[PDB]
């Protein structure tokens, strides 16, 4: 993956990041979809990634994982559909704040992986989606590491896993 995630010769960095970000959104959207039946208001009253990491709605104001993830994923899809942020027409340049928006998108998608690994790994294994989860996460992480798109603090919840995959 180290090579596949590298910027192709002559390829535009923003376009490269844009195309891959869409792919990552689709993969995590698919993976979370497989376990939504098990991520409920009762199972996850607060958005967390294990006993050591929790994600507040505002800060503190907390909310369930399903509500948190649905809002986060809806927001990402809206950004992908924003022609001013992710131009699809030829000649239209990416906005000046594109890199910043892309990093925010990736930092947020990471939290979905974190939640699934920490709170629903049992369902992943039962659905035999373990290999799929690991493969998509590895691609995601290798890409972010290649361009240093996610700060070290954000990655804390899956640091142990990150090292093993490396």
């Amino acid at each position: 993956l180290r090579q596949a995630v590298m910027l192709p010769e002559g390829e535009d960095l923003n376009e490269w990041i844009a195309v891959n970000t869409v792919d990552f959104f689709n993969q995590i959207n698919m993976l979370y979809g497989t376990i939504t039946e098990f991520c409920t208001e009762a199972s996850c009253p607060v958005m967390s990634a294990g006993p050591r990491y929790e994600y507040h709605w505002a800060d503190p104001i907390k909310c369930s994982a399903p509500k948190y993830i649905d809002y986060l994923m809806t927001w990402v899809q809206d950004q992908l559909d924003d022609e001013t942020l992710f131009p699809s027409k030829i000649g239209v340049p990416f906005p000046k704040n594109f890199m910043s928006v892309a990093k925010t998108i990736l930092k947020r998608l990471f939290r979905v992986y974190a939640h699934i690994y920490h709170q629903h790994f049992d369902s992943v294994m039962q659905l035999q989606e373990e290999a799929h989860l690991n493969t998509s996460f590895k691609h995601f992480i290798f890409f972010v590491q290649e361009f240093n798109l996610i700060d070290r603090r954000e990655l804390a919840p899956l640091q142990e896993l990150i090292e093993k995959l490396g």
Binding site: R52, D59, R108, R111
Partner: peptide, 9 residues
Amino acid sequence: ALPAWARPD
């Protein structure tokens, strides 16, 4: 705003 993670109580 979806702020950065925090250590739970």
